Amino acid sequence: GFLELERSSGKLEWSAILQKMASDLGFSKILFGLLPKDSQDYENAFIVGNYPAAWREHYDRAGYARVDPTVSHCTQSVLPIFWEPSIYQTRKQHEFFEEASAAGLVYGLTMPLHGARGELGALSLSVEAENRAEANRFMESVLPTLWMLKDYALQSGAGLAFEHP
């Protein structure tokens, strides 16, 4: 089932496969981001997914990589961080959550990625729900499968991003 990711050729097909797998687990929007070992900026990043273009552009332009609490979490942990104003603290973090919400990305989680060759990144996934309690139930229900998925995505994605011609 996860073998399809390795089987695919090209970032187009790979991203579509990952998006479908995530959708089948109940997540309508995902972002897979991966950096080479000891990256000092985002110039060499591999970023694929179906987050809206407007949000992608805004997050970049507003410098949210330095605000987003899930980013610093990824540098410190292999465990997922669930999206909660709570991981929000500062005024800019308040701004970030408000704007993410406005973009339609309210509930979700970010799974850190730490590759065998020092690759650093995340698979972030948003879930549409009536409320946070329901979102949490949807997410808990698929957490073991998502845990496998994130490592399969890391192993195959690192190859696609940085290695395969």
Ligand X SMILES: O=C(Oc1c(Br)cc(Br)cc1CNC(=O)c1ccccc1[N+](=O)[O-])c1ccc(Cl)cc1
Q: Pick from 27, 115, 123, 160: which binds a copy of itself (CB under 8 A)? A: 115
Provide the minimum distance between the beta carbon of 154 and a copy of itself in the complex, in angstroms, as a whole number.
6
The verdict on 147 binding a copy of itself (CB under 8 A) reads: yes
The verdict on 121 binding a copy of itself (CB under 8 A) reads: no
Cβ(36)–Cβ(119) below 8 Å: yes
Angle at 35 between CA 57 and CA 8, to 5 degrees: 90
Count of residues in contact with a copy of itself, rule CB under 8 A: 21
Cβ(83)–Cβ(70) below 8 Å: yes
d(CA 88, CA 83): 9
Per-position x/- string for 59-78, each x denoting binding to ligand X as judged by CB under 6 A, each - no binding: x-----x--x-xx--xx---
d(CA 29, CA 7): 23
Q: Tokens standing for 98? A: 């408000």
The verdict on 154 binding a copy of itself (CB under 8 A) reads: yes
Per-position x/- string for 90-129, each x denoting binding to ligand X as judged by CB under 6 A, each - no binding: ----------x----x----x---------xxx-x-----
